Amino acid sequence: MFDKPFDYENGSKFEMGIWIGRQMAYGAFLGSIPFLLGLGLVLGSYGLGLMLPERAHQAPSPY
Amino acid sequence: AEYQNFFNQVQVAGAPEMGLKEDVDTFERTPAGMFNILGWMGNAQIGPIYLGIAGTVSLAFGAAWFFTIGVWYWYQAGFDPFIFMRDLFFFSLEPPPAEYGLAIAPLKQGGVWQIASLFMAISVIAWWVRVYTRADQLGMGKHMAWAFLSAIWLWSVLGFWRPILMGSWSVAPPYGIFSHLDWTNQFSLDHGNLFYNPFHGLSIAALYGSALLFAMHGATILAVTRFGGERELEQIVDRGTASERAALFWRWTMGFNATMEGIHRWAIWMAVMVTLTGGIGILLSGTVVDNWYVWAQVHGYAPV
Amino acid sequence: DLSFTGLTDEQAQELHAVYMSGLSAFIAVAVLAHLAVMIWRPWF
Amino acid sequence: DLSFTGLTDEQAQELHAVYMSGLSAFIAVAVLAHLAVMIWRPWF
Amino acid sequence: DLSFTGLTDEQAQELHAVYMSGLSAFIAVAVLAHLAVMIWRPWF
Amino acid sequence: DLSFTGLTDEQAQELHAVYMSGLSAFIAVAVLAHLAVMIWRPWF
Amino acid sequence: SFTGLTDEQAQELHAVYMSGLSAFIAVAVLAHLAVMIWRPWF
Amino acid sequence: ALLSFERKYRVPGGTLIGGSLFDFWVGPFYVGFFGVTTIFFATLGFLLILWGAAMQGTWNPQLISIFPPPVENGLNVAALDKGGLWQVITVCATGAFCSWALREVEICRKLGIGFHIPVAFSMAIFAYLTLVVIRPMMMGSWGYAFPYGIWTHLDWVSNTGYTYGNFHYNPFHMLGISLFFTTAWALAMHGALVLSAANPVKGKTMRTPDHEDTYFRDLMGYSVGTLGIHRLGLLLALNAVFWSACCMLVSGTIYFDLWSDWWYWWVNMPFWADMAGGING
Amino acid sequence: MVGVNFFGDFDLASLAIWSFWAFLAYLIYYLQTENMREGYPLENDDGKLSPNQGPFPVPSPKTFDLADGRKIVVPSVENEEAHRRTDLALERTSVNEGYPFRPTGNPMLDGVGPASWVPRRDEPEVDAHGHNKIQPMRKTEMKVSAGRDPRGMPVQAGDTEVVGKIVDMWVDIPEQLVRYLEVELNSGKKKLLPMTMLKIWSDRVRVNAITSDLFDTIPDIKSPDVVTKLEEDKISAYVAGGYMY
Amino acid sequence: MSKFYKIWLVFDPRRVFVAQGVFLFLLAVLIHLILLSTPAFNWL
Amino acid sequence: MSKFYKIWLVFDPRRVFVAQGVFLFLLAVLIHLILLSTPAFNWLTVATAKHGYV
Amino acid sequence: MSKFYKIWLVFDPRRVFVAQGVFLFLLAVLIHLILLSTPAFNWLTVATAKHGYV
Amino acid sequence: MSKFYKIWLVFDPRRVFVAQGVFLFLLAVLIHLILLSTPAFNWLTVATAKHGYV
Amino acid sequence: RVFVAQGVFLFLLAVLIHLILLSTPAFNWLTVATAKHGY
Numbered sequence A: 001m002f003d004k005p006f007d008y009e010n011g012s013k014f015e016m017g018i019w020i021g022r023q024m025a026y027g028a029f030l031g032s033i034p035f036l037l038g039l040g041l042v043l044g045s046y047g048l049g050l051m052l053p054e055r056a057h058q059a060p061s062p063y
Numbered sequence B: 001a002e003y004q005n006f007f008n009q010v011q012v013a014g015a016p017e018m019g020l021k022e023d024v025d026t027f028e029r030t031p032a033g034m035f036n037i038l039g040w041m042g043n044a045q046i047g048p049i050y051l052g053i054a055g056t057v058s059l060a061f062g063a064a065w066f067f068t069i070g071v072w073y074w075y076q077a078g079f080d081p082f083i084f085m086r087d088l089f090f091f092s093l094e095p096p097p098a099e100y101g102l103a104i105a106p107l108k109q110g111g112v113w114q115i116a117s118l119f120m121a122i123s124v125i126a127w128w129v130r131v132y133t134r135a136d137q138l139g140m141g142k143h144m145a146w147a148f149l150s151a152i153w154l155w156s157v158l159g160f161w162r163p164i165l166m167g168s169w170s171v172a173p174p175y176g177i178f179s180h181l182d183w184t185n186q187f188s189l190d191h192g193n194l195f196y197n198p199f200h201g202l203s204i205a206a207l208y209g210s211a212l213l214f215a216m217h218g219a220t221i222l223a224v225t226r227f228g229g230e231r232e233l234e235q236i237v238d239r240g241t242a243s244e245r246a247a248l249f250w251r252w253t254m255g256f257n258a259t260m261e262g263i264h265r266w267a268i269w270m271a272v273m274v275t276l277t278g279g280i281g282i283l284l285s286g287t288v289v290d291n292w293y294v295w296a297q298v299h300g301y302a303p304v
Numbered sequence C, D, E, F: 001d002l003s004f005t006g007l008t009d010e011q012a013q014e015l016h017a018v019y020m021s022g023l024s025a026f027i028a029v030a031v032l033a034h035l036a037v038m039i040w041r042p043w044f
Numbered sequence G: 001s002f003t004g005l006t007d008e009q010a011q012e013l014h015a016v017y018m019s020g021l022s023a024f025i026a027v028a029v030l031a032h033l034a035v036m037i038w039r040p041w042f
Numbered sequence H: 001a002l003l004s005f006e007r008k009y010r011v012p013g014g015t016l017i018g019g020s021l022f023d024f025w026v027g028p029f030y031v032g033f034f035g036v037t038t039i040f041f042a043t044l045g046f047l048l049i050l051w052g053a054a055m056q057g058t059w060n061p062q063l064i065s066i067f068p069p070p071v072e073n074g075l076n077v078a079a080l081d082k083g084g085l086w087q088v089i090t091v092c093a094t095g096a097f098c099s100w101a102l103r104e105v106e107i108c109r110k111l112g113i114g115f116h117i118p119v120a121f122s123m124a125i126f127a128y129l130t131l132v133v134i135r136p137m138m139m140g141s142w143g144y145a146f147p148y149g150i151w152t153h154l155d156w157v158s159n160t161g162y163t164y165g166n167f168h169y170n171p172f173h174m175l176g177i178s179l180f181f182t183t184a185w186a187l188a189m190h191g192a193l194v195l196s197a198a199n200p201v202k203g204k205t206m207r208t209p210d211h212e213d214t215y216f217r218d219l220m221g222y223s224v225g226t227l228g229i230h231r232l233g234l235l236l237a238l239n240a241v242f243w244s245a246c247c248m249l250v251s252g253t254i255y256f257d258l259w260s261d262w263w264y265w266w267v268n269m270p271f272w273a274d275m276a277g278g279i280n281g
Numbered sequence I: 001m002v003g004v005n006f007f008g009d010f011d012l013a014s015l016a017i018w019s020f021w022a023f024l025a026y027l028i029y030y031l032q033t034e035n036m037r038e039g040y041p042l043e044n045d046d047g048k049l050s051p052n053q054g055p056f057p058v059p060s061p062k063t064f065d066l067a068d069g070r071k072i073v074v075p076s077v078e079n080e081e082a083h084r085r086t087d088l089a090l091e092r093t094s095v096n097e098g099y100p101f102r103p104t105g106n107p108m109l110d111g112v113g114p115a116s117w118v119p120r121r122d123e124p125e126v127d128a129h130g131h132n133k134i135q136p137m138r139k140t141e142m143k144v145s146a147g148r149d150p151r152g153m154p155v156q157a158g159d160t161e162v163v164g165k166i167v168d169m170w171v172d173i174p175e176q177l178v179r180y181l182e183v184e185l186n187s188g189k190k191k192l193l194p195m196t197m198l199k200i201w202s203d204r205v206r207v208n209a210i211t212s213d214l215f216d217t218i219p220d221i222k223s224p225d226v227v228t229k230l231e232e233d234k235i236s237a238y239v240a241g242g243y244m245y
Numbered sequence J: 001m002s003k004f005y006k007i008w009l010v011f012d013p014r015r016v017f018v019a020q021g022v023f024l025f026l027l028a029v030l031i032h033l034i035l036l037s038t039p040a041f042n043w044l
Numbered sequence K, L, M: 001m002s003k004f005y006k007i008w009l010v011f012d013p014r015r016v017f018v019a020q021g022v023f024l025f026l027l028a029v030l031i032h033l034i035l036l037s038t039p040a041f042n043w044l045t046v047a048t049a050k051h052g053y054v
Numbered sequence N: 001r002v003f004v005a006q007g008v009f010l011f012l013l014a015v016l017i018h019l020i021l022l023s024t025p026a027f028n029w030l031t032v033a034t035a036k037h038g039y
């Protein structure tokens, strides 16, 4: 529904360019899925820590 | 949304299976029954149990050990049932102090611990004999007995062999919920960060590997239950598509695979290794190496 | 006529021409962004 | 006359010619970048 | 002749000639690099 | 006169001849390297 | 015979194996003689 | 090369991304798009660990250690020589693990089997992300994650555990320990039982599953079954890892004192706290 | 023996750890060799012997003694030949190795890919007493003790259509486990549906693996009350192949 | 060169376009994350 | 040698191209990260010192 | 000796070429990293000292 | 003995050659590492002392 | 499936936002009440 073949025979240049753009946009969305998941994980954990008591951010360093 | 085969969708039951005779005395078997709650994930039958001599000895002496610890706890509670419940996890039956060495100690000062330990040892030996003989009378290959022997090895190193080598029963762990955790922590502290014991690391690797391998094998078998993959023995003698698909999954994943029979060899050795290496690691502590961090520094895997 | 994709030669040429036009447009946009950044904060 | 891939000799020659053109372009760009860096920040 | 891989003698000879040419080029480049390093910073 | 591998006596002889030539070349190179090390920094 | 070999094949294989063993032992003896001359351990 | 039965299973289809672009094998390894990404991430992580060894100045494999940025750095992206290399390696490891799971999903789809294996692997991935991402961010800094070293991360484990006294007293920790021990015990029993059925006493024919059920019913009065034992092993391992993750999640975020002191609410319940005698007076 | 070294810093702990390394190397070799009793020797894409066979040699043959007098030598030519599919409707997609094989006809009907079946022995699996392990519930005295009884329920396929009704269940007698559901199609024919690839709702049995048109071509059992291992493999392969096809 | 279009005779463009989109997005994300490391170019 | 084209008679170009792309991107990223790990050759830090904004 | 070509009668070129490529890449990377881990032969360090970059 | 060629009547050449290559590489690496861990025969350290690099 | 998921999502979002407001002393309505009324 997102990755579709192109009808090269009986196909205009403008449609070909739009199709290449759509394929690359779908690829960009697929590549954005892990970036968005990681950003959400990090920021949500940080926000939850911000909502934690004050002692959560004062633990001794394990090194 | 598909069926994951973690629980049965429907249960069926007839007369309970009383077991194959082979070379087993059927007079020692009890009656059997059903428990429908256990039939969702496994078998609902609480089948017959073999009584025999080894089972009777093991039950009697294990109950004696359990009741010895219990009456010691009641003595520590001063007959008070409310104190008994309030401090149940804090009660401890400690070994004799280091002054008495390996000799028989007074009851109040470790004799009760020695009595309980002897009862426990008798029970464990009887249960090992039971495992071996139940394997033998059905014509099976004694693998369970050898697997149990590794755990027995670790257990006897903790309580018998290392105390003998150290010259006192005091170094053995006590009988208690919180007290034996404290004993474990104090052992690590006294022997210089047991993390740096190489056999301790090997035992941890084997434990992690046992968890990993059982996860892999269970997931693989449940994945091929579409083709009757859990019938492992028949797949061993008459290979089906389940075995082939499992082998091909793991070969395409990591480049090498197992067979329906050899995966269980992997499993048994991985599980045996944790106790096999742990016994050696515990036996080396105090008798050969008394500070594992300094030993690691000498042998090049700790910073100087 | 070596083809691993089921594409004829002329179709490949036209597709490459369109792809290169888009690539040049993308390069131009990237160049504009880099010039803006360089004016705002040079890294050399 | 062995051919593991199924390609003929002339097909292999044409593929190698185009591949070498691409490699030449890549190496030329790399050489220009290296010369620019050597002028900007010598490492020898 | 004995052939586990299915190749013939002459195919093996031709492949080995090409492989030896490639190895010779690689070794020549390595020798030049080692000479340059030895001149710039000897390790003996 | 056994053959687990399936080779003939003459095939084994040819294989051994090539293998011994390779081993001789390897050992000669190792001997030259050892002589050079002994000259540079003797260990006896 | 669990291996499938015959008596004569076993004899020839053993002869070649003993030749290799003799060569290895002779080299070891020479090495030990050199070590004993250079740095005696007795 | 191929196994003697492998040819009929190497068919196209089952990929998630790219169609037939990467639908091929390299030796025994199926590649796919996620295999390409896995090889990239794994090689980059390995080479960056080697480079961090070069910066550290040691080539002993047991002394190499890449440390996260200091606690004072917060959640900022650190300099590569000041903990940023650890962050890059962590990103590479996360990418490699996720790509491995998705490649396993593709292989499952090609072979027409279930996804129990990738789900179980995702459980371990969740545990790893808990130790390196969730807990350090809930504590406000990347500096609370463990380092990448064979024994230095053991030092990290020791220090983190002793931050809260004796870590044995964490209840979720006790549950996880019990589950791991049970998993090892069950694995030993299952391997031994299957091998003893497959390798009977000499002169006897191969044993049936009825023999296994009879053996375990004779020994202890209950048999879970082959399907049951596989389900039980999988669930035991998954629960062990999940409860270990929970034990680490609750420590340092909502609990900061000694767990041995946590265990004293039962003792200090007022209706028997002052009753003289016993251990706690 | 604290501080007692045999030579240098080599003490009892060092001896133990090095001995463990040697033992672990041998154990890994043994475990890998024990797992090479099936699927070897390796072949190429044309079915010919692969020039590379791996560093681990194939172990010496081992024999399994069956209760009916049959001997199985698992690493043998006979074992490989008995389980080898013939006349596979497959075609190479490339001259190079490592590329997928394309099904020439109907992959589900031809039994290739995820629909592949293995030619198991054409006899039913038996228990220790010699009785057939899997039998229909009408031939036993078992009863439904929990869950939902699917007998009499309609069967809905993956295309949201009714293809028949459940008439009986097939049960593993030694394990007391339901393994197959018997369905009477609207055409009157009876088929076997694996339990592991269907869902039992409150009012229907849903089979998403295959559509209505594919239910008529499910492989059949020769005898109405006996199912053999080969028939089980064929039915399971056909049903599991529907997810891809 | 002018013969680069033949790359579309080797790899199917649609899948290649999807993969290129993935690669370009991830490369941009990586460059932004690298820029965040230095305060001078930290735009947050 | 003028006969190097015969490498395409040995190796499938598609898999070769995939491996080459992965290898070259990996190598470029590795070299850039090595240079960024060295403060003397970290061009961002060099620009920071040269222009002086942080 | 001039009969080494018969090695291709024993080993398939594709597998040998792949293994050789992996070996050479790993060996070159290892040697470069060994030189970089030694400050005496770290060329970036030598350049920094020579040109006064820090 | 002139009959050592008969070893190839006993052992398959492919596995022997693979094992020999791996063994020789590991042995050479072991000897080089032993020399490098000894400062008296570490050629990099000796070169540094001889030329005053550090 | 849609209705249950939407209900869970809305309830969890509301609980999370209410907890965020509660942990903020500036918007903590109980804290505001006890400060204003001298509780």
Ligand code: BCL
Pocket (backbone or CB within 6 Å): B200, B201, B202, B204, B205, B206, B208, B209, B212, H045, H046, H049, H128, H131, H146, H150, H151, H153, H154, H157
């Ligand atoms: C789980 C809670 C703690 C922790 C606590 C401990 C303790 C306590 C011990 C270990 C031990 C080990 N841990 Mg640790 N470990 C953690 C997280 C990790 C992670 C990770 C990315 O999550 C990894 C890869 C490791 C890796 C390792 C191994 C070096 C070793 C044996 C494990 C094993 O066999 O497992 C089962 C897996 C297998 C059997 C399969 C094979 C796995 C191989 C052995 C992994 C090798 C990794 C290699 C050294 C480095 C990887 C990167 C390279 C670039 C490829 N740890 C966290 C922080 N770990 C033990 C040890 O000996 O330490 C010295 C030990 O005592």
Ligand code: BCL
Pocket (backbone or CB within 6 Å): B124, B151, B152, B154, B155, B158, B184, B185, B187, B188, B193, B194, B195, B199, B200, B203, B204, B205, B207, B274, B275, B277, B278, B279, B281, B282, H157, H181
């Ligand atoms: C602060 C505490 C110390 C420490 C101190 C110790 C000590 C001390 C010991 C271990 C031991 C073990 N530790 Mg450690 N350990 C620490 C940190 C860790 C960490 C971690 C940080 O992640 C991990 C994963 C481990 C993991 C492990 C295991 C791999 C190992 C053996 C486990 C086992 O099977 O035990 C339990 C299994 C048994 C005791 C076998 C029992 C066999 C008998 C026959 C069965 C029971 C008898 C009878 C039937 C009972 C009644 C049953 C009735 C039905 C009621 N340790 C730190 C560094 N650890 C042991 C070991 O081997 O170390 C080398 C050990 O003795």
Ligand SMILES: CC[C@H]1c2cc3[nH]c4c(c3C)C(=O)[C@H](C(=O)OC)c4c3nc(cc4[nH]c(cc(n2)[C@@H]1C)c(C(C)=O)c4C)[C@@H](C)[C@@H]3CCC(=O)OC/C=C(\C)CCC[C@H](C)CCC[C@H](C)CCCC(C)C
Pocket (backbone or CB within 6 Å): B058, B059, B061, B062, B063, B064, B066, B067, B123, B124, B127, B128, B131, B144, B145, B147, B148, B150, B151, B271, B272, B275, H181, H182, H184, H185, H188, H189, H192, H219, H220
């Ligand atoms: C490979 C190493 C792993 C392993 C292996 C292993 N253990 C084994 C086996 C194997 C292969 C067996 O064959 C054997 C077995 O039979 O398993 C079912 C066993 C076994 N491992 C056991 C336990 C066990 N294993 C452990 C560990 C492990 N065992 C390792 C992880 C642990 C841990 C982690 O601490 C424990 C607790 C047993 C279930 C069993 C051995 C049974 C036994 O020895 O019984 C004799 C002992 C007793 C009878 C003691 C007393 C029991 C009761 C407390 C008696 C009192 C109560 C009375 C009956 C009722 C009172 C009611 C009221 C009046 C109160």
Ligand SMILES: CC[C@H]1c2cc3[nH]c4c(c3C)C(=O)[C@H](C(=O)OC)c4c3nc(cc4[nH]c(cc(n2)[C@@H]1C)c(C(C)=O)c4C)[C@@H](C)[C@@H]3CCC(=O)OC/C=C(\C)CCC[C@H](C)CCC[C@H](C)CCCC(C)C
Pocket (backbone or CB within 6 Å): B208, B211, B212, B215, B216, B219, B253, B254, H038, H041, H042, H043, H044, H045, H046, H049, H089, H090, H092, H093, H096, H097, H100, H104, H117, H118, H120, H121, H123, H124, H147, H148, H149, H150, H151, H153, H237, H238, H241
């Ligand atoms: C139920 C959870 C248990 C489990 C499950 C599990 N793990 C699994 C699977 C399953 C079901 C797989 O399918 C998968 C697999 O393929 O197994 C063969 C996997 C796997 N479990 C593995 C290991 C592993 N599992 C562990 C744990 C467990 N896994 C749990 C107990 C541990 C522990 C406790 O330490 C380890 C070491 C791998 C063998 C494998 C996943 C292989 C993989 O991801 O491959 C791609 C990545 C690489 C080849 C290398 C990447 C390297 C990085 C880029 C750089 C290094 C980064 C790392 C953080 C450094 C760490 C240094 C250490 C000293 C800390």
Ligand SMILES: COC(C)(C)C/C=C/C(C)=C/C=C/C(C)=C/C=C/C(C)=C/C=C/C=C(C)/C=C/C=C(/C)CC/C=C(/C)CCC=C(C)C
Pocket (backbone or CB within 6 Å): A016, A017, A018, A020, A021, A024, C018, C019, C020, C021, C022, C023, C024, C025, C026, J027, J030, J031, J034, K025, K028, K029, K030, K032, K033
């Ligand atoms: C750590 O290392 C760092 C990050 C510091 C440095 C490492 C760096 C690297 C290695 C960076 C990049 C390597 C590459 C290889 C980057 C990308 C090269 C390419 C090949 C980019 C391709 C851009 C192509 C793009 C967007 C597609 C353009 C096509 C667009 C729609 C579709 C074509 C349709 C076009 C209709 C017509 C429209 C155009 C006009 C003029 C009308």
Ligand SMILES: COC(C)(C)C/C=C/C(C)=C/C=C/C(C)=C/C=C/C(C)=C/C=C/C=C(C)/C=C/C=C(/C)CC/C=C(\C)CCC=C(C)C
Pocket (backbone or CB within 6 Å): E002, F011, F014, F015, F018, F019, F020, F021, F022, F023, F024, F026, L004, L006, L007, L009, L010, M020, M027, M030, M031
């Ligand atoms: C700390 O302890 C220390 C390390 C000090 C102890 C030191 C120990 C040892 C144990 C050192 C070494 C012992 C050995 C055994 C060293 C090696 C001896 C060997 C056996 C060297 C082999 C060299 C062989 C070489 C290069 C291979 C020559 C073969 C070359 C190509 C292959 C040609 C053969 C062919 C090609 C097949 C073609 C022919 C046909 C008919 C197809």
Ligand SMILES: COC(C)(C)C/C=C/C(C)=C/C=C/C(C)=C/C=C/C(C)=C/C=C/C=C(C)/C=C/C=C(\C)CC/C=C(\C)CCC=C(C)C
Pocket (backbone or CB within 6 Å): C002, D014, D015, D016, D018, D019, D020, D021, D022, D023, D024, D026, J003, J004, J006, J007, J009, J010, K027, K030, K031, K034, L025, L028, L029, L032, L033
């Ligand atoms: C710190 O120091 C370190 C550790 C980093 C030192 C490590 C160093 C290394 C290992 C450096 C590099 C070793 C290599 C091996 C570098 C790369 C050499 C190569 C071989 C680069 C190749 C670049 C190839 C390029 C651009 C060509 C891509 C080819 C193309 C566009 C053309 C192909 C498209 C085609 C041919 C048409 C074919 C189809 C038809 C129908 C004719």
Ligand SMILES: COC(C)(C)C/C=C/C(C)=C/C=C/C(C)=C/C=C/C(C)=C/C=C/C=C(C)/C=C/C=C(\C)CC/C=C(\C)CCC=C(C)C
Pocket (backbone or CB within 6 Å): D002, E014, E015, E016, E018, E019, E020, E021, E022, E023, E026, K004, K006, K007, K009, K010, L020, L027, M025, M028, M029, M032, M033
């Ligand atoms: C710790 O120890 C340290 C690391 C310090 C030192 C230890 C060091 C060692 C042991 C280093 C290295 C030992 C070796 C043995 C390194 C490798 C030497 C070799 C053998 C390099 C081979 C280079 C081969 C090269 C470039 C050739 C690749 C071949 C080609 C281009 C030719 C292409 C061939 C054939 C195309 C196609 C023919 C097709 C037809 C149809 C005729």
Ligand SMILES: COC(C)(C)C/C=C/C(C)=C/C=C/C(C)=C/C=C/C(C)=C/C=C/C=C(C)/C=C/C=C(\C)CC/C=C(\C)CCC=C(C)C
Pocket (backbone or CB within 6 Å): F001, F002, G012, G013, G014, G016, G017, G018, G019, G020, G021, G024, M004, M006, M007, M009, M010
């Ligand atoms: C800590 O304790 C210490 C280490 C101090 C003392 C402990 C010491 C020990 C235990 C020392 C040694 C015990 C042994 C038992 C050492 C070895 C004795 C042997 C048995 C050495 C054998 C060397 C064998 C050698 C060279 C032979 C290899 C054979 C060959 C080349 C012959 C090849 C055979 C056959 C080619 C092909 C013929 C085929 C046909 C068809 C005729």
Ligand SMILES: COC(C)(C)C/C=C/C(C)=C/C=C/C(C)=C/C=C/C(C)=C/C=C/C=C(C)\C=C\C=C(/C)CC/C=C(\C)CCC=C(C)C
Pocket (backbone or CB within 6 Å): B066, B067, B069, B070, B071, B073, B074, B104, B114, B115, B117, B118, B120, B121, B155, B156, B157, B158, B159, B160, B173, B174, B175, B176, B177, B180
């Ligand atoms: C109302 O409640 C009643 C009174 C009915 C019963 C309540 C009972 C309780 C509360 C029972 C137990 C509570 C506990 C806490 C039991 C034990 C838990 C543990 C953790 C036992 C751990 C033993 C742990 C280890 C290493 C022991 C290994 C023991 C050994 C090898 C045995 C050593 C054997 C023999 C030493 C020494 C023989 C030598 C002589 C001179 C006799």
Ligand SMILES: [Fe+3]
Pocket (backbone or CB within 6 Å): B217, B221, B232, B264, H190, H194
């Ligand atoms: Fe199993």
